[PDB]
Amino acid sequence: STGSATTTPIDSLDDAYITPVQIGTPAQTLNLDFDTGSSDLWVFSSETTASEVDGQTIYTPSKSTTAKLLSGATWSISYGDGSSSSGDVYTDTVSVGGLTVTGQAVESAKKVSSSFTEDSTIDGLLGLAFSTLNTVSPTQQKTFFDNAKASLDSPVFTADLGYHAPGTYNFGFIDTTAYTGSITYTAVSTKQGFWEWTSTGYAVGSGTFKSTSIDGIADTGTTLLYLPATVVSAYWAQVSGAKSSSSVGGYVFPCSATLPSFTFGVGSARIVIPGDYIDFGPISTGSSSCFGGIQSSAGIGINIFGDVALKAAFVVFNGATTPTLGFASK
Numbered sequence: 001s002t003g004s005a006t007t008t009p010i011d012s013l014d015d016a017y018i019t020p021v022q023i024g025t026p027a028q029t030l031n032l033d034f035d036t037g038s039s040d041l042w043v044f045s046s047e048t049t050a051s052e053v054d055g056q057t058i059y060t061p062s063k064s065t066t067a068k069l070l071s072g073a074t075w076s077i078s079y080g081d082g083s084s085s086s087g088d089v090y091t092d093t094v095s096v097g098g099l100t101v102t103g104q105a106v107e108s109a110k111k112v113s114s115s116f117t118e119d120s121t122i123d124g125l126l127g128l129a130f131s132t133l134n135t136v137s138p139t140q141q142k143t144f145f146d147n148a149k150a151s152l153d154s155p156v157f158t159a160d161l162g163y164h165a166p167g168t169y170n171f172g173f174i175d176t177t178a179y180t181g182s183i184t185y186t187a188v189s190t191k192q193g194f195w196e197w198t199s200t201g202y203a204v205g206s207g208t209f210k211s212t213s214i215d216g217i218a219d220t221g222t223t224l225l226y227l228p229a230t231v232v233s234a235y236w237a238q239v240s241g242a243k244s245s246s247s248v249g250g251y252v253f254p255c256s257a258t259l260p261s262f263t264f265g266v267g268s269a270r271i272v273i274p275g276d277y278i279d280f281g282p283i284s285t286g287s288s289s290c291f292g293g294i295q296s297s298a299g300i301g302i303n304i305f306g307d308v309a310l311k312a313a314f315v316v317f318n319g320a321t322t323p324t325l326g327f328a329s330k
């Protein structure tokens with residue numbers, strides 16, 4: 001089997017991407033944030049505290065003939081920005097882009113933090129990291145990809161995120177029309193439950209490439225590119241007026257700037273992130289200070305190749321017995 005679904009930025013800055021997902025019988029379509037950095041499929045629901053729902057589409061298990069309470073199971077998750085959600089669990093039929101999994105754990109939110117409430121465009125998350133990170137207790141649950149894998153033509157999914165445009169998530173096949181040149185594959189460590197790999201270095205603009213190992217994760221659920229302070233300082237030093245602002249919480253730059261590109265290494269290959277991809281616009285409406293798309297990972301404990309990086313590539317998440325990651329230009 002295979003599946004193919006379009007993923008769409010939630011706003012003009014590509015702050016996140018949503019993908020329609022069918023849950024239950026008859027289908028209830030919710031727009032979920034596919035997140036290769038977590039492993040819970042959770043949704044706004046009829047059980048979500050009413051004051052914490054503001055425009056989201058909800059899953060109502062009582063209206064699904066295939067929903068079953070997973071008795072006793074609860075979940076609770078916190079994300080990197082301090083946001084969180086928790087609730088109980090149903091199993092139900094879940095389809096993405098024509099690919100169907102029966103008996104998928106659908107984590108129904110009883111509580112969500114303010115950031116989630118305040119974003120009416122995201123109806124939940126669909127985690128695509130390794131199932132060892134799944135938070136369901138007392139019986140840990142599998143991701144949609146883990147459940148689908150045996151039925152897939154090939155045990156892979158691909159992320160093809162657009163810059164200020166829609167893109168595609170494919171399951172079970174590699175679309176050889178979706179990228180240019182060849183795909184370079186690189187080793188993955190699953191020790192922390194992430195798609196963790198080691199980049200071979202970087203360049204800033206037309207500068208010389210610096211060979212240096214940068215361990216990090218391929219994370220569709222993070223907006224920006226978070227790298228070591230040394231690397232990030234070298235980037236922003238090439239932009240007149242750029243500075244790290246503690247009041248804003250990162251590097252900002254004059255909105256009048258033309259940003260340089262940023263290149264990262266994948267083996268002997270190179271992925272170039274155009275300068276424009278690194279512009280996240282005014283820090284507040286009407287400001288002439290703009291927020292940078294490359295930020296230090298110093299306060300995080302891991303480097304994160306988030307959407308800024310991933311949307312410059314066609315990315316293969318290979319869930320074979322020995323997992324790997326593939327990157328191609330496009």
Ligand SMILES: CC1CCN(C(=N)N)CC1
Nearest residue numbers: 033079080081083221222
């Ligand atoms: C919408 C959610 C995506 C995952 N998160 C994160 N990387 N910190 C939390 C917000």
